[PDB]
Structures are given as structure tokens and as C-alpha cells.
Amino acid sequence: GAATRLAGISAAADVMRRMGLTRRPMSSYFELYQRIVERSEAMTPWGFPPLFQFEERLSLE
Amino acid sequence: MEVYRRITERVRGALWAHHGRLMSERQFHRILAFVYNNKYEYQIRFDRMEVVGREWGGRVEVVTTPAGFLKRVRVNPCVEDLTLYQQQQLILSAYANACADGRKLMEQAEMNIYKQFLKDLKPIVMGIRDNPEFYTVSENSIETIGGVLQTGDSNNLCHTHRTIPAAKARQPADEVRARQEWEQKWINSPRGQSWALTLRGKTYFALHGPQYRPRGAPGAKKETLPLDIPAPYTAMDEKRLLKKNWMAYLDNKHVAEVMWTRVKIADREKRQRLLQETGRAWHRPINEEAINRW
Amino acid sequence: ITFYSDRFLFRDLVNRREASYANVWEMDDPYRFLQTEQDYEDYWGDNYDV
Amino acid sequence: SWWEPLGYGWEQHNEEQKALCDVTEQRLIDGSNLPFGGKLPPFGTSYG
Amino acid sequence: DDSDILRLRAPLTYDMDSTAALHVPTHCGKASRLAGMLQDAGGVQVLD
Amino acid sequence: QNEDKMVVHVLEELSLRNDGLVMDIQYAIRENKKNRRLRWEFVTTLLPVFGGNEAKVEQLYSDYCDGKYVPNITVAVEAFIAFLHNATQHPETYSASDYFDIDDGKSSTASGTGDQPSAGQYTTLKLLDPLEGPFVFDNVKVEYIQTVERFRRHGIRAGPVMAPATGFIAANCKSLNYFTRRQEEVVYVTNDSDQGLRRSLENSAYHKTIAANPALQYLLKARRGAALVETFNRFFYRTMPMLNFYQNVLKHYSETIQPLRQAAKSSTRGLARALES
Amino acid sequence: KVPHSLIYNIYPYLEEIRRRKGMMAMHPPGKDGLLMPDRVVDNRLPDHLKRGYYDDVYWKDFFAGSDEHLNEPRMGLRGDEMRRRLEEAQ
Amino acid sequence: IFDGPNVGITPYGGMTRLLARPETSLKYPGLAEFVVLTGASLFAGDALR
Amino acid sequence: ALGRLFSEKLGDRDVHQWAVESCADGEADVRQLLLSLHEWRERGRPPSLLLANVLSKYLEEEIAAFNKGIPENAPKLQLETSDGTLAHSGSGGSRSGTMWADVDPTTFALHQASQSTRSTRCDEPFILHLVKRAKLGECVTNFTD
Amino acid sequence: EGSLEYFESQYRSAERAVYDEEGRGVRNYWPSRDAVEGIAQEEENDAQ
Amino acid sequence: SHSSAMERAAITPTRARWVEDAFADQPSVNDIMRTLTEIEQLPFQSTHN
Amino acid sequence: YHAYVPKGASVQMGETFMPSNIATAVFRETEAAAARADKTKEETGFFSQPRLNYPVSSGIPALFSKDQFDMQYSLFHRDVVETLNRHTLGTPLEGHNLETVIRKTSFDATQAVAHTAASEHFNYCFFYKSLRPWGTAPPPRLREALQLQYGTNGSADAMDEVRRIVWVTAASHQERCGWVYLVWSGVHFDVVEFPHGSCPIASDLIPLLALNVHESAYILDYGTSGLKQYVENYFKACNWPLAERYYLMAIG
Numbered sequence A: 001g002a003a004t005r006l007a008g009i010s011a012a013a014d015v016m017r018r019m020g021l022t023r024r025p026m027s028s029y030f031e032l033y034q035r036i037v038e039r040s041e042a043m044t045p046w047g048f049p050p051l052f053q054f055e056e057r058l059s060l061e
Numbered sequence B: 001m002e003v004y005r006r007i008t009e010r011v012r013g014a015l016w017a018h019h020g021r022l023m024s025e026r027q028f029h030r031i032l033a034f035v036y037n038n039k040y041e042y043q044i045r046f047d048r049m050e051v052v053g054r055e056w057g058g059r060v061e062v063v064t065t066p067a068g069f070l071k072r073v074r075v076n077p078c079v080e081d082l083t084l085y086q087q088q089q090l091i092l093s094a095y096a097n098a099c100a101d102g103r104k105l106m107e108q109a110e111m112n113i114y115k116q117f118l119k120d121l122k123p124i125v126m127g128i129r130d131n132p133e134f135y136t137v138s139e140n141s142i143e144t145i146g147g148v149l150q151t152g153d154s155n156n157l158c159h160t161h162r163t164i165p166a167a168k169a170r171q172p173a174d175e176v177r178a179r180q181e182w183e184q185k186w187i188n189s190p191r192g193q194s195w196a197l198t199l200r201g202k203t204y205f206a207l208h209g210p211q212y213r214p215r216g217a218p219g220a221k222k223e224t225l226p227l228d229i230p231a232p233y234t235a236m237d238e239k240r241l242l243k244k245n246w247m248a249y250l251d252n253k254h255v256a257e258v259m260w261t262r263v264k265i266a267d268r269e270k271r272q273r274l275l276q277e278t279g280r281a282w283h284r285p286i287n288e289e290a291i292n293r294w
Numbered sequence C: 001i002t003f004y005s006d007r008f009l010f011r012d013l014v015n016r017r018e019a020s021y022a023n024v025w026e027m028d029d030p031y032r033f034l035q036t037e038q039d040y041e042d043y044w045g046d047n048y049d050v
Numbered sequence D: 001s002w003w004e005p006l007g008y009g010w011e012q013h014n015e016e017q018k019a020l021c022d023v024t025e026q027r028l029i030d031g032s033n034l035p036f037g038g039k040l041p042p043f044g045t046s047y048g
Numbered sequence E: 001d002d003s004d005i006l007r008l009r010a011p012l013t014y015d016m017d018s019t020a021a022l023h024v025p026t027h028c029g030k031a032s033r034l035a036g037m038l039q040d041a042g043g044v045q046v047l048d
Numbered sequence F: 001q002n003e004d005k006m007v008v009h010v011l012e013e014l015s016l017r018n019d020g021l022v023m024d025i026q027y028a029i030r031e032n033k034k035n036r037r038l039r040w041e042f043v044t045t046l047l048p049v050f051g052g053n054e055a056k057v058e059q060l061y062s063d064y065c066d067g068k069y070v071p072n073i074t075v076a077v078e079a080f081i082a083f084l085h086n087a088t089q090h091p092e093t094y095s096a097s098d099y100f101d102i103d104d105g106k107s108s109t110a111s112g113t114g115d116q117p118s119a120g121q122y123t124t125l126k127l128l129d130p131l132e133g134p135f136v137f138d139n140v141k142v143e144y145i146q147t148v149e150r151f152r153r154h155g156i157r158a159g160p161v162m163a164p165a166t167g168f169i170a171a172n173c174k175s176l177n178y179f180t181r182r183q184e185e186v187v188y189v190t191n192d193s194d195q196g197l198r199r200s201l202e203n204s205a206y207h208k209t210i211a212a213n214p215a216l217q218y219l220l221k222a223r224r225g226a227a228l229v230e231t232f233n234r235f236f237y238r239t240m241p242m243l244n245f246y247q248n249v250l251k252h253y254s255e256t257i258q259p260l261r262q263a264a265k266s267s268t269r270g271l272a273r274a275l276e277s
Numbered sequence G: 001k002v003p004h005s006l007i008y009n010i011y012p013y014l015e016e017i018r019r020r021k022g023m024m025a026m027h028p029p030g031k032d033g034l035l036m037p038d039r040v041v042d043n044r045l046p047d048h049l050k051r052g053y054y055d056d057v058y059w060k061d062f063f064a065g066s067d068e069h070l071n072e073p074r075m076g077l078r079g080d081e082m083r084r085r086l087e088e089a090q
Numbered sequence H: 001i002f003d004g005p006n007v008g009i010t011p012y013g014g015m016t017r018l019l020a021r022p023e024t025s026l027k028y029p030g031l032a033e034f035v036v037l038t039g040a041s042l043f044a045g046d047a048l049r
Numbered sequence I: 001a002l003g004r005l006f007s008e009k010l011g012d013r014d015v016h017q018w019a020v021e022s023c024a025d026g027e028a029d030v031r032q033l034l035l036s037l038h039e040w041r042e043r044g045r046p047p048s049l050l051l052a053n054v055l056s057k058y059l060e061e062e063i064a065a066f067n068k069g070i071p072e073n074a075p076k077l078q079l080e081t082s083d084g085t086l087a088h089s090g091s092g093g094s095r096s097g098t099m100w101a102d103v104d105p106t107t108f109a110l111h112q113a114s115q116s117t118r119s120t121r122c123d124e125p126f127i128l129h130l131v132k133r134a135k136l137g138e139c140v141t142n143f144t145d
Numbered sequence J: 001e002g003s004l005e006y007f008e009s010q011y012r013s014a015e016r017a018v019y020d021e022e023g024r025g026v027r028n029y030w031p032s033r034d035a036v037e038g039i040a041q042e043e044e045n046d047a048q
Numbered sequence K: 001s002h003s004s005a006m007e008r009a010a011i012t013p014t015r016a017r018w019v020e021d022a023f024a025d026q027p028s029v030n031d032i033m034r035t036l037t038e039i040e041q042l043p044f045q046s047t048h049n
Numbered sequence L: 001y002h003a004y005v006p007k008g009a010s011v012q013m014g015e016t017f018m019p020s021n022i023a024t025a026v027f028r029e030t031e032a033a034a035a036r037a038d039k040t041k042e043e044t045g046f047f048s049q050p051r052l053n054y055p056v057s058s059g060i061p062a063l064f065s066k067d068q069f070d071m072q073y074s075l076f077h078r079d080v081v082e083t084l085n086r087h088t089l090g091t092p093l094e095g096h097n098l099e100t101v102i103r104k105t106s107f108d109a110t111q112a113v114a115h116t117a118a119s120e121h122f123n124y125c126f127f128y129k130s131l132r133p134w135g136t137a138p139p140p141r142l143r144e145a146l147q148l149q150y151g152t153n154g155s156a157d158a159m160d161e162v163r164r165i166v167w168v169t170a171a172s173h174q175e176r177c178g179w180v181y182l183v184w185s186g187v188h189f190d191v192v193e194f195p196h197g198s199c200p201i202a203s204d205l206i207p208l209l210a211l212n213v214h215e216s217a218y219i220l221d222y223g224t225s226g227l228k229q230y231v232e233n234y235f236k237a238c239n240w241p242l243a244e245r246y247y248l249m250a251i252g
């Protein structure tokens, strides 16, 4: 049950481009790509603790 | 109702597809309403008469208005001896035969209705395709951002038809005026004189003189030139909306677009079915490059 | 606050689908809303005439 | 009254005029002066 | 024998087969309504 | 020589001075060539005169279509006759395809012509319905139809129901086509002046077998030749529509040609002195 | 379940269930309502044709300042109207 | 299974129409008689085709 | 293909001049074929049979030369109006050299005008115009000032 | 009815005033400044 | 997910051919029976088997 | 309905000219077509033939019949792709660009199969992209660059000179197996001839125009001796503005 991640990234860059999210066009795609490539090297990279994953009372530094 | 609504939407959608005209919702529903009332009138007059179906021999007679309302039942005393079940089935099948006859009449009447309706759409429909700018391309011709591509195959097979005379315009109005010129020409001539004293003549003047209708008598009192609604040359509902509020403009625009799309999809379905029936098309997609490769 | 079942309308629905009418006036007259006398009493209470 | 201040189709119409018209008669619309810089503002910034 | 299969093509009468025609819609709806319609017509009339 | 023209010469000259007119003649020619009906009528009308190969008849059809052929008046008349014969001997095919108006015996009044119009006779030769006929544009085709019907129904004779009088090639002239300058090659069969249709009829080998049919007797004797003239023209209008088509073309050409030359020279010289200046 | 308060909305539906008998339940014989395209129609013209086209129907110079309907927008225009154009251009 | 001349009766159930559509005569000429005379089963594939 | 055959043969010389040439005093109205030529070259359209007849009897040697080597079953280039309509989706695209059924006028015009061969008016002094075009480039309009 | 009549009348007059002012009989696309901006004396005559 | 191999089919194409040689356009059951009878006698080496 | 209609046939109007026999034959063909479509769907490898930007249902104008071009597209080329796929799977070259297959199999035996196939696939692709159906007139900037090199004191002499030199190079290739290119060395233009199983990318040039000098290409139409006529026609049908924009991108 793990699909391939290309459609997802081309989509998520597409949205930020068609939404007006960034003043300069590339920034959307670059940031989204970069942030993934850095996490690729991390132990258990694609899983996250449920509490620290997002906005919650206590957070990470 | 249905057959009519399909065609009316065909007209509305085509109206905005080809030229930038929108038909007022008011208008669109009033067309339909007229078909409806037509049918209603036909019902009014259809209930004044009766249809007789009959079962076994003439033993079982059923008298019923074409709408299917049951009026009288005559029965041989022979039936009285059967069973309640068979009595029931017998009268029931007589009733069915009545409904058959009535429904035959009715369907003739309906064909009549459809014809009047078409005739009434004709100034609009023709109104869109009889313009100096109206055109179509073959459906199988690829379409790209700039314009439409040539379909390659069988350079004989593609013939462009033209509705309009290319030299100076001859409109339907001119043709009706021609008709009344020949009417008066025939009338005013000898041998058109003696014909106007015949029964044929007075029949003709009965039906087709409006000018002779006494004041207050029903029907048109002049002869009317055919309606002219040239589509690209007449602003309809988009002009009022574009002045008043942009939001309603965008929404009516939207509707016309959606209807057009829907119509086109239906035409694709009928096409597909017709293609499977003759066995040129399979029952599941076998060619996915015709879809996925864009 | 009554909550009807989904098919609640079925009886009436087959009664309507199967109705037949001698002429069209009978089909839709203004007063087919009314059967018992109670109805005739509530529909005209206002005109002291009728 | 908010539609005219932003020349809407300006880059297109500029293109049309520059390509198909003589330089003697053409009216060219400049985007720098136009309200947002002739562009669509970045998402959250424009109050809507 | 052939003449008998010739016979089968003849439509249903009630004198040979003792059975009414099937016509299926109108048996669908009006089968349970029949007593109603009939007694609204004031019952049948037994003639001779 | 700038005087005598053929039809092709006219279309290729006019091709320069009227765009739309030529576009219309040519579209129409295409649509008439597409018809199965007008072809079937041409073929099965001229078949008996040659009596021969359908190759020559079909060739004559295609050539007829361009104006490159008009039938000779002799051939015309004996085609008329041939038709009357083939219609009377076996009526089944030619009363179910070539139409006659049948007498209504539920209508009876006292007159010489009207009574032979009332009982067991052929009243008139019928033209093709507007769908199966010669080309008309789809603008007006509806009104055209309505008019044709409203007229035939109530027995009005005028407009589209009446047949135009068609010309043919004279006996002494060997010419194949219509010419713009030469009017004496083209012959009309009129009521008053006749081409010998009677004298060709009575002296024909088919006269007694045609005099047998009770239904055609009115179409022979009614107004006298005014029944037999009308019958004639009507036939070749319903069979070979395009003789009149091209006729009206060349008529129109010879009419409007010189005004267009005036215009042409005037505007051309306009940009000419405007150019050198 | 359906709330008692909301049932009135079904009434028009239920209404013309009842009113559909005969002649209003009728659909035209032979006619579906879906008419597929078959041929290809184009009535478009070269401009010198559609210059003098409508002049016995409407006024002369029917297509004058019309840009979509003409490939040449300026034809037929009398001078000062042509001037209006460049005048708002500068 | 549209059968029943095998039980000595004529087939019932309306499928006869489907079998006699000009379409079926087109795609599978002779199939109609095959199934009506011989009681023989049809399956998903053939119902689809 | 017809477009560039023409634009090649005509070459430099005046459009109007050629249009007074191709018409002797009696041939056709210059206004008409001028109109149709304008609508055919830019705003790419099917040529009116007027313009097609003129062009046919003008370009006949270049068309005969473009048609000279072709194999049997391959598309030729022919101007014939024998059939009524002008829509070049009708001919097979074999009437002019067009590959398209229809191209909307504005886009076509931007395209062929993006081709520098399309002739700019240059009411300026010629050499000065060309020098400016070389030194400043087309990037002179990069600046809004 | 009767607005339209008047309206159309004055159009006809105004146009045969612009397109040829001198009644020579041929259509002129290069009219004088006075025939273009000049008012109908008919309207005046009608007030009178 | 689909293929022609995978749908359940009684009339798979040779079967269609056979059927239309047998039952197509035969105006009785008797014709059908002597047609069949004539077919069962074909050798194993005949082209048409 | 497009999906359901098989790959080859066209969807058109009923004239009702069909006898029942051929009407059944058609459905049979369609059935088999569905079958072979099902097997082609799994036989599909990594690489695939290019979509053609122009309709070839009739021939490519002034150049090819339907059968010539289609014998290239749907016979030799489609084969080349079969081989390429067969030999790029099971190897370190699985699932990379056309390039990095062309480029990393260069100049060597034992990958010779893969390289030949790949470079062939490219040559064909670029060939189709090199033909514009009614032909184009070569654009001013390219005309200028070409003049500075080939032009000897004549107007756009560079064009007839290039279209001459190409003919020459084509006739000077004896094998009748291969490709003639107009390419940009990076310092100058020139016309090269590549043998079968070699491409401009392996030799790191930048290609502008491709010409197919395989005999299979002109044999159905121009015959055995008809190469000159062939090339001459190719210039009626070639695509210049492509070569131009590629040239300008190479420059910057």
C-alpha cells in the first residue's frame, strides 16, 4: 500500500504555482523539493510522532 | 418534458458556443411552457371523444377515453359464468386494447406537436447557422491551442457544406414576400379569377386570408413575415446582465457552457453506442493512447 | 418532530401514479384538497357568506 | 469601479499592438504603474 | 405434424385456448385498481 | 474575339469579376451532381432515344451537367413521346415515379375541361418535391417547401409550381451548347408557336397506343396544345432542370457584364494614377 | 429518516406524478432529442463578398467597425470614424 | 440459461428480444437459434460482447 | 506553402504595384483582390477563388516546380475551385499549403509577424532604423522608460 | 410604433446628408467637416 | 485490470465461426439437422474441420 | 468512444452501404484487434515510439506516400524500439534517459546492440521532428549564420548551397544505410554523414536537421536510383525554424 511519490510532488508544486502562493514562481518548487531531500537522510524519515508532527500545545525546538 | 428539453438545451448551449449570446432563463422556460400548454390543449380536446376496445368475439366491450379513463363496460352473460379471475383478466385485456387505440391516436397527435415546436424553434436555430460567420470543423479533427488540425485520411471524404448563398443575401423574408407576390399574381389574373369563385378558391381564402377576419374573431388578422433573429447581430441577455451585475453574468455564462458540454457528451454516447452496435467498437477500452497520450 | 421512514410516501405514490380523470378540470380543480366536512369548514370560515 | 484601474488584458493587448500595428499609431499599456505591477498579487497579501 | 405449429402463430382467442391476452403494462399498474375503476363506472352491464 | 462565349468561358471570366456568383453556380452544380434522383430521371428519360449503352447516356449526363450538352429539339420531342409510350404500356413504374395528378371523383362540376379533370384522368404533370429536386440553399428551403405545398394543395398555379419554358437546339443547327451571342440556336416550345410536337405525335408510330389511354386524353385535348405544351415543358423541367439553370446563368452574364467592366477599369486606373503620382 | 418539517418539498414531484396521465406522458415517436452531427458546415466568406452582403437587408456598410466579423476592420469606414480610432490612440 | 425445449416447453423471460436484436444477428449470426433451440449457457464475456 | 511560394517570388517589390500589374484595366477590381490578399497573407485564411485564379496564373511555374518531383500517392499542391466552398478543411489542405483546418486570425498574425520577413513600415530614415535595430536590439523595449 | 418611424426618418435624412451632401448621387467616404458635425435643419423646421 | 483472455466466454471465436456455419439462416429445424449430420461426417484431415 | 475504437480504423458516418457479410467481418477484426491490444499492453517496455505532431493518415506532402512513411514508422522503427527495449532491460541501463543509454553505450562492442538500437531510435525520432508537412521558409537569423559560412557573394546563397552540400554528402554515402545531418560543431556549421547505428549525440554535436538516407526510406517511391529527387523533395518538406531555434539555444 505505498504508492509512488512523483505524482504527489508534481501535484503539490502545481497547486502552489496555480495558487498565487509565491511572488517568484520557482520558489514553490525549490523549497518543496529541498525540504524533502534533506529529510531523506534521516532515520525513519517518512514517519512522524503524532503529537510533534503538527501544531499542538507542546512543540519541538 | 424530456425530448423537448434536450433539444432546447441543444439550442441554448449552441447559441453561446457559436456566438457570445445568452438566452434569458425567462425565454428558455417560456419555450418549454408553450410545448406543455400545447399538449394540454390536446388533452382538453381529446377527452370529448371515446375509444372502444373489445375482447373475446364482441362479448366483452370496454369504452374508455383515449387518456385511459374507464367509462363503460358491456358484457355478455356468458362471461358471468367464468370465474372472477378470468372475468378480471378479460375486462383487463379489453381495457388494454382500448388503451392501445387511444395511445395510437395520441402518438399521432404528439408527432403533430413536435412538428409545431420545431417550426417555432426554426427562427432561432436557423438564426444561428444562417450567418456569414458560422462554421464547424469535422469532429475527428485534432484541436490544439492555436487552432484546429487537418484530418489526414481520404481527401475525398471531407466535403464542406454551405447553407448560405455566397453572393448578395437572400433571406427567408424575401421568400415569403415572393410567395405573396405570386399569390396576388395568381389572384389578379384571369383563370385566377374564375378559380377564386370555385370551392377551391373560397377554401383557400377561408384558411389563408387573415385580412378578411372580422374584428374580434380569433386568429392572426394580418399575414406575418417570418421572424428574424440573427444571432451574432442581436444582443440578448448578456448585455443586460453585463450592465447590471457581473456575478449573474458569470453564472448565466457558466450555465450555457455546462449545457453545451452536456449535450456534446450525449452526442458522444449515442455515437459510441451506434459504433458498438455495428461492431466497429469494442465493449471496453482497447485503445488507451487515444485518451492517455494527451 | 416526527421522523418518517424513507419509503413513507409509497401508498400515496401508487395512488397518484394510478389515478385517472374523466376530463382535465376534474384533474386539477381548485377544491380536490377537500373531502370531509371539516375541510369544507376550515377552507371557508372566512367568508361569512359561503 | 474596481475593474478599469487594473488594466486586465494589458500584456496581451501590448503584444497585439507591438506586433500588428504601426509604431505611429499604437497605445501601449505599462504594467509598472498599474495597481499591482500589472500582476496578480501573491496569495495572502492583497486583502482579497 | 406441421399444421399444428402453423396453428401456434394465430393470436390468442378465448374460444380455443380459454386464456386472455397478456398485455403486460396495464397488468402492471391497473391489475389491483380494477375493482375501483369498474365500480366507478357503475359496475358492468350484463347484456345478451 | 470578345463576343461569342461558352459556359465554361463565362464561369472562368466571371470567376474574376464576381466571386460569390461563381461560388454559388459551382456549389449548386456540385449538389445537383450528387443527386441520385436527377440522374435517375435523366438516364431513364433519354434511354429510349439512344436505346443503347448506358455508357453513352451516363457520359451525356455528366456532360449535360456542365452545359457542354443541350439535347437537340428533335431528340427532345421523341424523348417526350418515348416517355408517354413507356408510361402507358406498363403504368406501374411510371405512375409511381413520374407523377400525374389523379382525378377526384368526389368533386363534380359542369365544364368541358374540369369534367375531364374530375373523373379517371391525369390532370397535370407533377414536379419533384423540394427535397428531391434541383438545389436550393438551406436558408430558404423551409419557406420554399411551405410555399410549394400550400400552393399544390389549394391548386394555385404560380411561383415554384409553374415550370419555366426551356430552350433546346434547333433542327438545322448542329451546335452542342448554349451561346451568349447566338439566340437562334436556342428554341422554345411555346403555346402559340409550336415546334411540331403535334405533327411529330400524330405521325409517330406510337399514336394509337397512346390514344388508347383514357387518362392522357385530357392532357392531349384540354386547352388543346396548352395542355400538351405545359406537359412538355414541365417534363423537361422535372427531368433536366439545369438547362434552364445555365440559361438563366448566361442571361444574367450578358446582362450584368459591362457595368462590372466599367467598375473594374475605373478602380484599377484609380490606384494606377494614384500609384504613379 | 425524513423530517416531518421537510416533506412539503416533495409535493411538486408527487404532484406531477399525479398529473402525468395521458398526452403529458407522451414522447414523440421516433425522436430521442439527441441529434448527432454528420456533415461540416461553414458559411464564412472572403471580405469583399461580405462587404456588400447585407445592403438590401440592413444598411450599407453593415460590417464597419466590427473586428471579429471582419479580417479587415477598417474597410467601409468613412474617414473621420477612422480618425476617431487613432484619436483615442493618442 | 434461456432453455426449456429440453423440458418440453418454449423459452420464457423476454431474453428472446435480446437474441433477436439486429445487433446480435450482426455480431454472431446463428447464435440466436443456437441458444433458443439448444439449451446452452451464456456467460459474462458473451453478454458483454 | 502557397504563402511562402508567393512571398518568395514577389520578393521585395510593392504589393500594390503587383496588384495593379496582375490586373490589366479590365481584369478585376483591385480593391477586391487587395482585400483578399491582405486577409490571406496575415490573418491567414483560405484565399478567395478570385485571388486563387490570379495567383494560379501568376505563380504557375513555382507551383509546377514544387510539384515536379513528387511520387504518385503523396499530396500534391493544387489550386482548383471546382467545388464551391473555400474552407481548406474541405480540400484536404491540398488547396493552399495548409496543414490546418482553421487557425484563429490573431494568433496566426502574431506568428507570421514574429517572422522578421514580415515587412515593417520604417517611415524613419532606413539606415538609421537598421542601425538602431542592430545596436539597441529588440531589448530596447525591455525598458519602460 | 411612431417613435420608430420618426427615428428612422431622421436617420435616412442624416445619412443621405453625410454620405452625399450635394445630391450628385454617388457614395462618398470622405465627407466635409460640416456635413459630419452639422445639425439637421429638419428638426428645427419641425419645432417651428 | 482487464483482458480478453480473462473473461468467461462460451462463444470464443472459432465457436462463433462454427455456429454461423451451422445455425445461421436456416428456415427450419430439419434443415439444421441434415446440415449437422453432413458436418459430423467430415474427416480429421479436411481443411474445413 | 475514442478509447473503444481500435488503433488503426477511423470513426466515420454511416452511409448504410454495408452488406451483412463484411459487417460481420469487421466485428471479427475488431475482436482480434482487442486481443492483440491486450498482448501489446503487456509487451510494452520502457521506451516507446514518438507521437507524430502531424497527421500521416495520408502521406507527408510532396515527400512520402502513406505506405512509405508508414513502412518506416510502423516497420523498421518500431522494430528498433523492440530491440532497444529487449536489451536495455536486464542491464545497468534500465530506466534512464534515451541519452544516458546513447551516451554510456558509446564506442564499444558488447553493448553494441544497445547502442545501435538507441541511436537508431533517436535518429528516427529526430527525423520525424525534422519534417514539417508542407515545408517552411528558413528564418532570417539562421539565414544570416549560414551565409557567414557557406555563402559566396550571393543572396541567401547559403540556402541553395546548404541544400546542395546535403545532396552531395548523401550521394557520397555509399552504403545507403545511415543518416545525413546538418549539425553545429559548437564553433561552426557542417553537414555530416553518420553510418547506421551512430548519432550526433554520441559524437556530441548539436543536431539541427536530420535526413534519412536509408534505402528503405526512398525505395517504395523514388526507386533504387532516385535519391537525388528524394533529397530535393525533402527540402520541400523539411522543418527549418526548428533547426534555427536549436541553433540559437546552442549559442545562448
Ligand SMILES: [Mg+2]
Pocket (backbone or CB within 6 Å): C011, C012
Ligand atoms: Mg393509503
